[PDB]
Amino acid sequence: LXXRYXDTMY
């Protein structure tokens, strides 16, 4: 979310 964060939030 609001960018890229692996695969825990996105």
Side-chain angles (χ1 to χ4, degrees), residues 4-10:
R4 293 180 181 181
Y5 191 87
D7 191 351
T8 61
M9 183 64 75
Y10 233 67

